[PDB]
Structure formats: structure tokens, C-alpha cells
Amino acid sequence: AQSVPYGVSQIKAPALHSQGYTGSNVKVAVIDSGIDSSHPDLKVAGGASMVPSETNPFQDNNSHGTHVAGTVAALNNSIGVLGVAPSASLYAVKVLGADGSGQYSWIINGIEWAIANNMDVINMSLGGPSGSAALKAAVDKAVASGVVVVAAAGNEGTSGSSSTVGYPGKYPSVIAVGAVDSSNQRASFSSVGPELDVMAPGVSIQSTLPGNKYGAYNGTSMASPHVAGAAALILSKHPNWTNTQVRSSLQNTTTKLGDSFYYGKGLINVQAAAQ
């Protein structure tokens, strides 16, 4: 049988599926470690690899990318899980090697590809502790071009008075996503700061794993794809909305969870946002 991960229902995606909005014809680029396109519960539309030594983007030697992809768009059938936007056009942009790391330039390159290939939404379940003029420029460029850019806020917890949001989550052009649990409490590892935008389920997230498996991961990595997926659903309902309109709807219709320093605007509500 098929299982609906809690995160999926927590953000109210199912209410949309039932109205017939499943993210059809929305192009979402998962900028990560690749995606196991052979997974029975995934349908990869295409992709490109930016890792010099690893040319097949459809080969996930890390597993992270496959997991994230599953949250975005695991297929609606009678097996595995169900993604937030199961009808979305999934593109695998591999910018990370097997070890889960990538040079800043590989990441930038992926963003460039993303823009040039008309992706609607970009998901970046990755981060670094420092910025770059070039990194900033690529994300700014994506948003100027009409792309919805979402990234993990980071897993640095709290550090006194300081913001612990990583890059590219830190940039204002990006929707930086924090992690809450099934009870809407902030996960202890979830980075905090003025730059945190919204929260999504990031604890015990059941998704797809390479070689026809399923498993649960924790991380702001897991929260991100929920928002990426939601954006896709909104665009499936409102194909004519701008990235700005998408972002706004998501930010203005959240469930307040507490102090913005810790929670940004709160938990996303795709049903409310799609209104």
C-alpha cells in the first residue's frame, strides 16, 4: 500500500490533491546529490550534473537527493509514499558528490542551468557557513528571472543573540526554511535568525531512498522540499502567479507558532496559501 508521510498532510497538500491540484506541468529542480531515477516511486523529467567526476545526475550515490525528491513528488499510486506535488516535473541537478559536498561553483552552475532551462521552482537542501558575491548573484538572478527559490535554513541551532542561518538561506531573495516536528515545535538543530522565513516538517520525514527503499531523515533539508512542493501546488492552481505572488501567499497564510526569531512566519498552509 501507499503511505502519506505526516509532513505531507501537516501542510495540507491533500486538500489540494482532492480538488485536482497535484503540481502538473510545474518544473522543479532539486539541486542536490542527484536522484535515483530508477526508484519505482519517482518519475524524473530530466536533469544535468555539475560534478566533474560524476556525470550521471540520475545516480544518487549519497541518497540525500533521492530522499528530498521523494518529499517533493513521490508518485501517487499504491506503493511507497506520496510527495507534496506528485504530478510535478522533477529535474535532478547534481551539484554534490557522493560525500554530500560540492564546490561553491558547482552549486552556482546548477542555479545557472536551472534558470536557463526554465525551472519554476528550485530547492536547495544544502548550505555553507559563508556567503560569496557569486552565490548571492546567482540566487538574486534566479528570482529576478521569475524562479521560486527555497533552501534549508541550516542545522546550527541557537547561538546567543546571533543568527545561525546558513548560505544561501541567509539571502533575502531566498525562502529559508526551518524544521518543526509533528507537534509543531522547532527542532533543536533548526538554525534561527531574522533571515528565517517559514517552518515545515523536518523531523522523522519518511521518503524515498536509493535502490527501491524508504526511510526517515531529520534536517532542515527535509523541511525545504515541503515548501518547494507547496509552491508547485500553488502554481498548478495559479499558473499565472509570479514568484513574488507565490512567496507572499506562502508567507501571509502561515499558522503562527511563536517568536519569528525562532519560527519566521510559522508553519506553511498550502491549502490556505492556494486560496
Binding site: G100, S101, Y104
Partner: protein, 64 residues
Amino acid sequence: LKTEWPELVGKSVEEAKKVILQDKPEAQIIVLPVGTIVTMEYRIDRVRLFVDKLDNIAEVPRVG
């Protein structure tokens, strides 16, 4: 509950591994190049070590 090792920056990889394993015996160590972007999944027993061209710790090792 030692989750960071400030003392190790500048130390060699081999040296670093010994201190860590001493503090957190169950640690799963991974060596990566400094100045890289990484995945944002949180693993409670993992310790990422970012090294320079010299194989010396370039950033404060911390759990996650």
C-alpha cells in the same frame, strides 16, 4: 555532551580523529574539503571534518 572541538583547528586529521573518538566514541567521522557546500540532513552521531590542502582541520568540528 561535548558537541564541538574548537581545540582541534590546525591539528592534523589523524590527531583530530583520536580526540573526537575519545570524547564521542560513537562518532562517525567524515573528511571533506574546506570551503564546500554540504547537505542539510542532521545526523546525531556524525562529525564532519573540513580540511585544508595540508590535511589540517580548517573549521571547528561539530556534531551533525
